[PDB]
Design a binder for this molecule. Structure first.
Ligand code: HEM
Ligand code: KE2
Length: 394
């Protein structure tokens, strides 16, 4: 007697389990059990992942409904699962998306300056260096303080909420509410602070006092700050960290991008495609009976969209484990999702990684792991896959 297949399969972010390819071939939608004990449908082919993400009857909002089968416990108030919907309904979607592009004057230069300063400090201190805690995550934090218009010195405290906020837990987490309420209070004070005039929070502060927004709640304005800081920092920091591993393990690619930095955008797009930073499939709740492959998913059931199932599918990306800079379909991966909930920070996330890699390859052309790859410690029961430390020499 066996048990129902459990998800997630592995917290290791340096390699995909051989098991994913076997599953995609044999059963590209199949029943699994999540850490809560709920049953769910795990979808692992490119075609069926795209189908689910482009059909809004598979709803992200309804995953928050009381009594639903759950992937994990909520770490935000349930109305925040509808965050982008709430922003759109408030008439704020265009302004929010405009504030988080990489295109504001001076933003790219600030990113380069910050990355170079972090790297110079590591070089001064001498190898080994930890590229997660002392490069990728501080670069992500600095970027999001600048994008939000808030003081750089406020970044570390906001950052330290995230090791709990993005937990993937069977049960509610008391610390998550403590930190959430504190971080909301912080952002509410930012909106009242006359010195905050730039970035996303400076723009929201003006719109809040504009008559066209007089009935938008103060709670939503503060929530936009907390959520875009948290999603952006955890996503860019975790992605850059595991991209650095993929790059360091490919010395030929490392040297090519060092020699020809104009290929860095194509390289980052492939690093996005093969990235294992998302620890769980993306969750959706069926709001109707819907045919997905050989399975009739029933109303009220949970569906999990496995991004690396799609992104390593050889029917869409031949030789899927190979980084190839000349693919005919290079941005067609699902690293930023697809459909209604496509990542609103995709351009900024690309530029964060491109600039971080450019700066690293120039400052540390001989970068290499300082420990055997199996010695990395992979964070468990978390919404991202990340090594607790990333020790390198150069
Ligand atoms: C490389 C970096 C990033 C990656 C890999 C990434 C990935 C994703 C993915 C896969 C989704 C879809 C989730 C779903 O459909 O369930 C998403 C949504 C989102 N991302 Fe990103 N993201 C990144 C950077 C950022 C940045 C920089 C921000 C903000 C500054 C951000 C904010 C968000 C938000 C707010 C959503 C939810 C959108 C919605 O529900 O409609 N992300 N991201
Ligand atoms: C835990 C946490 C999540 C967020 C993002 C915020 N929460 C949501 O549930 C929905 C959907 C979602 C999107 C991306 C993601 O990675 C997880 C969920 N949309 C949002 O914008 C922000 C701060 C947090 O502490």
């Amino acid at each position: 007697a066996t048990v129902l297949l459990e998800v997630p399969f592995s917290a290791r972010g340096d390699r995909i389990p051989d098991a994913v390819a076997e599953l995609r071939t044999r059963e590209p939608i199949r029943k699994v059990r999540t850490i809560t004990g709920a049953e769910a449908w795990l979808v692992s082919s490119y075609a069926l992942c795209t189908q689910v993400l482009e059909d809004r009857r598979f709803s992200m909002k309804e995953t928050a409904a009381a009594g639903a089968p759950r992937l994990n416990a909520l770490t935000v108030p349930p109305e925040v699962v509808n965050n982008m919907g709430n922003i759109a309904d408030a008439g704020l979607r265009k302004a929010v998306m405009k504030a988080i592009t990489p295109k504001a004057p001076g933003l790219e230069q600030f990113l380069r300056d910050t990355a170079n300063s972090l790297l110079d400090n590591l070089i001064t201190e001498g190898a080994p260096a930890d590229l997660r805690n002392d490069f990728a995550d501080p670069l992500a934090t600095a970027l999001h303080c600048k994008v939000l218009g808030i003081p750089q010195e406020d970044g570390p405290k906001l950052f330290r909420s995230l090791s709990i906020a993005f937990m993937s837990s069977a049960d509610p987490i008391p610390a998550a509410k403590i930190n959430w309420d504190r971080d909301i209070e912080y952002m509410a004070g930012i909106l009242e602070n006359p010195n905050i005039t730039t970035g996303l929070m400076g723009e929201l502060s003006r719109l809040r006092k504009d008559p066209a927004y007089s009935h938008v709640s103060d709670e939503l304005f503060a929530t936009i700050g907390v959520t875009f800081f948290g999603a952006g920092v955890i996503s860019t920091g975790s992605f850059l960290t595991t991209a650095l591993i993929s790059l360091i393990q490919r010395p030929q690619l490392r040297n090519l991008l060092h020699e020809k930095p104009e290929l860095i955008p194509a390289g980052v797009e492939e690093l996005l495609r093969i990235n294992l930073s998302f620890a769980d499939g993306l969750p959706r709740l069926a709001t109707a009976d819907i045919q997905v492959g050989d399975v009739l998913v029933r109303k009220g059931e949970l569906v999990l969209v496995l991004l690396e199932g799609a992104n390593f599918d050889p029917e869409h990306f031949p030789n899927p484990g190979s980084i190839e800079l000349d693919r005919p379909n290079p941005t067609s991966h699902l690293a930023f999702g697809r459909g209604q909930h496509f990542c609103p920070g995709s351009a900024l996330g690309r530029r964060h990684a491109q600039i971080g890699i450019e700066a690293l390859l120039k400052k540390m052309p001989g970068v290499d792991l300082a420990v055997p790859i199996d010695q990395l410690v992979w964070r468990t029961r978390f919404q991202r896959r990340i090594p607790e430390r990333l020790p390198v020499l150069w």
